[PDB]
Each structure stands twice: as C-alpha cells, then as structure tokens.
Amino acid sequence: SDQEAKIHPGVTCDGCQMFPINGSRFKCRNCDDFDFCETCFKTKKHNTRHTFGRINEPGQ
C-alpha cells in the first residue's frame, strides 16, 4: 500500500489547487481553512510562525 494513493475527499490544496489532495495532507493550525499537499508543504512560502498538522488519511 502507498501513501500517495490515499485521497482526502473534499480537501483542496491551497498551494496548487490539487483536488482531492492525494498523499499526506498538511492542515494549517493557524489559518481558518488552509491545506497543503506534501509537495506544496515543502516548497511554498507560508507564514513561518504557522504550524501544520500532518493528516495521512481521513479521520486523523
């Protein structure tokens, strides 16, 4: 089984508009409703004082 195959239904990556996010999902703990896919999480600029929660699969 492959983490990249996991999808998060209804979740858009705000960095690249991927929908649904596949792979691990990174939800910002400070923004109201902001998510990154993993590539965007590693490469896009974001408030350096915000912290993201890693959600590998729906329900976490």
Task: Note the residues at the interface with Zn ion (CB under 5 A).
Answer: 13, 15-16, 18, 28, 30-31, 34, 37, 40, 50
Say how many CA atoms lie within 13 Å of 2 toward its Cβ.
Answer: 3
Q: In sequence order, what DSSP letters do the residues of 49-60 get, joined into one string?
A: T--EEEESSTT-
CB of 51 to Zn ion, least distance (A): 8
Tokens of 33: 């409703």
Confirm or deny that 43 is annotated as ligand binding. no
Closest CB to Zn ion among residues 11, 13: 13
CB of 3 to Zn ion, least distance (A): 15
